[PDB]
Amino acid sequence: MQKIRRDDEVIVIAGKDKGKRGKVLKVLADDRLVVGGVNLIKRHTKPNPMLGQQGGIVEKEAPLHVSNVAIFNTETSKADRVGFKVEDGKKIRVFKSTQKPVQ
Amino acid sequence: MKRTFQPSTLKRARVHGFRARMATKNGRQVLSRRRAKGRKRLTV
RNA sequence: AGUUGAGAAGCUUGCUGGAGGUAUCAGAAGUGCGAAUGCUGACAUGAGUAACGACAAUGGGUGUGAAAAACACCCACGCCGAAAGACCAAGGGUUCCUGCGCAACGUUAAUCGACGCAGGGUUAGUCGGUUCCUAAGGCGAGGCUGAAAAGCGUAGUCGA
RNA sequence: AACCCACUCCCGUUGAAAAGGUAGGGGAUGACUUGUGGAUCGGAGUGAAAGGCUAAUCAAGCUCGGAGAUAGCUGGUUCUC
RNA sequence: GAGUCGGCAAACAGACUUUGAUCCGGAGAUCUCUGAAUGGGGGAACCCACCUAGGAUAACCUAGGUAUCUUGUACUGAAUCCAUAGGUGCAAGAGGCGAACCAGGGGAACUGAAACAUCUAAGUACCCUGAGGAAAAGAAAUCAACCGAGAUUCCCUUAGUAGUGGCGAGCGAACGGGGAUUAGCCCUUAAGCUAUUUUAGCGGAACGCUCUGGAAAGUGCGGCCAUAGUGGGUGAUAGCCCCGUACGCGAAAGGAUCUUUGAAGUGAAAUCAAGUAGGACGGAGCACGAGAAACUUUGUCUGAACAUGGGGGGACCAUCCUCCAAGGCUAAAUACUACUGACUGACCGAUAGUGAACCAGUACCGUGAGGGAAAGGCGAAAAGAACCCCGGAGAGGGGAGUGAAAUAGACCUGAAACCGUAUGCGUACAAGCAGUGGGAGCCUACUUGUUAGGUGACUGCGUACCUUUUGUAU
């Protein structure tokens, strides 16, 4: 239904920061994913108007494409493709290397 | 001097209005032709 | 920039450029522009030249402002006064009023504006409409006339 | 005199204006001028008749089709040996 | 099946998680005023109403109804005794729109003929009226020659042939062959019958290290998938990272198509033919322009035999052959695309391709019908420039920071004409298509001068290019 949900833990392949173990926070609708901890950006922002402040340089994460991260296995501890080969009451996300269901 | 256009709203609607064009048979063909080109107005 | 061929043209490199290119030999052609008072965008010469829209005149002061011949107030001059004043009908469509502004517009400058952004603002038994009745004229059930469209017209119902 | 009209001179002609202006002129109780609303249309209307006017167009409008009309006539026709 | 509140685009406020929240498909409910517009009128998006049954307070609100014409059907009843016209009440149907296709009604001109009246163009453009998903046409009073063929419609030949034609320009058959398709029946009127696919989805195989780089799909080095290897897109070139690609399951519920099936029409399903055939003037259609002109048509005027008859076989006549006219019904092969959906390209790549990649039939130009443009691109990602200094508290710059790169800064590349700023050499006593042949000097480079480049005092010859023409600096 989708390989990657909100509450996962992934690793990054083919980017600025490959091999960074991460964890998904927000999934956008244009196959772009905000991974918590990686792909840091810095925005020169004006100090906020109407009784606000921002000051200067504040970090946040910029999203990256869904074809870059993959579901992390923790039994070979490397990236693994996932699949839906088990369907008996529901499509269960299952690794294709070991045929074991993800949690 | 006197230019060839003196405006009025009562003479404009009785000659070029919708209920004037829709009354005759030529005018109902003026409506369908001007509609199917796709104009925004049809009643100038 | 160099260099090679009778020529159309080919080849190797310096910098800019930032992802596509086509030995060779065959095919398929929207296949090669200087000129058609050719077509559509750009930029020149004329040239910082003519003009700046009635020959009803303005001169000081004080103010604001980054900056006053033109903005506001003051004092004094001029001009229309069967209009250059007031008001209804058309027509227009927010140009009216107040804060904020001055890049563009206004034949110059602008702090000013019929110019931008944001708010505001039209109160009816009697005034005009609608409602009632008709003129010219229009449309016209039934009805006559006409290849077909349609034409004319009685009752009627619209039209200041 | 308002008002309608256009006889003369000069200025203007890239005009302030695709027909005006400043001075002077003619009619000014009627074959008058004019506001609103209607009627007549393309080999067809209207016309105190000039071939005049019918949306700055008229010896027969404007627009879309026949239609890429027809032109023994003008103009142009693009790389080498 | 875990995120969501449409697009051009921010901060508020909140709804549900594991299922019905977004989101996609079927069915229903609401559906303001205009418009065939239909209760009567109107300047389209407005005004004035009635009637009935109910509710509501000197002011209303619900709920329906209320157009003309056809057909039928009741009731009603004029001059007129009867009884038709006429008038009401009810039922059923139609009206309008749409690109092309089809059949009918009406039907030009320019132009060809090197002029032009016959003729062509052409029964074409256009204008009306009908109907259908196709229509029309069709089951022998047909063609052939003494042999025979048996409905129509469409393509290929006969053949640009016989003919026709101011015998000019031109227009042009049939007979016979080859194919596509393969049914024939009869009374609106003697006496009629006229079982699969489709709109939503779901599963869907196979990769690892190593270099350079901002970033690997690329360099290397190996392995695997395959009924799916030339797809799209991911920070650069990916069968194995992501979405997809070959087969099956379907589907509460509708739709359509073949069936049973229901009624009725689709309609399997009986004869026959009077102002009819023919005739006489006047026209059309036949390839056929009064031509020896057969045949079909119908505006005017006429008129038969009874299938022992009849009419055809290109003037006409005898002999032979072959068919039953004056009543009807019919599938298939066929024509078309405003609308869809897949796919495909020796098609376009923003002056091309739709007029229109962009908020285009818009802006604008017209009293109107009508005409009708110009307008794409920052980066992989907004990381879209905090902070400082000059300035009007601005505009614009100078830094600084982001980034692989700001001469990528609100924009890829970035040419020519046009305008400048620096550096070198020549020009203030010299006459002209502004170049060419010789040539002094100076400059900057290289070995330092033919090693090369740039200027060109002086001087000899020299009247641009194209088109028309007997000739052009003209």
Is the shortest CB-to-strand distance from B9 to strand C under 7 Å? yes
Positive or negative: CA dihedral B6, B7, B12, B13: negative
Name the residue range of residue B25's domain: 1-44
Residues pairing with B32 in the sheet: none
Burial-class residue A43 by CB neighbours within 10 Å (0-12, 13-18, 19+).
exposed
B42 contacts B35 by C-beta, under 8 angstroms: yes
Residue found by looking up tokens 């009025």 in the block: B8
From residue A99, alpha-carbon distances to A26, A82, B21, B24 in Å are: 28, 9, 76, 79
Bases of chain E below 7 A from a protein C-beta are 1-4, 18-19, 35-36, 42-45, 97-99, 128, 202-208, 214-217, 233-235, 238, 241-243, 355, 361-363, 366-372, 380-387, 401-402, 404
Q: What's the CATH code of the domain at B22?
A: 1.10.287.3980
Distance CA A90, CA B3 (A): 82
Largest CA distance in chain B: 41
Distance CA A82, CA A4 (A): 9
Residue found by looking up tokens 């950006």 in the block: A41
Number of domains chain B contains: 1
Q: How far does the CA of A93 sit from the C1' of C16, in Å?
A: 53
Q: How far does the CA of A86 sit from the C1' of E394, in Å?
A: 68
A9 contacts A23 by C-beta, under 8 angstroms: yes
Is the shortest CB-to-strand distance from B33 to strand D under 7 Å? no
Name the residue range of residue A101's domain: 1-103
Number of domains chain A contains: 1
Spell out the SS3 assignment of chain A: CCCCCCCCCEEECCCCCCCCECCEEEECCCCEEEECCCCEEEEECCCCCCCCCCCCEEEEECCEECCCEEEECCCCCCEECEEEEEECCCEEEEECCCCCECC
Distance CA A98, CA A80 (A): 9
Resolution for this PDB entry, in angstroms: 3.3
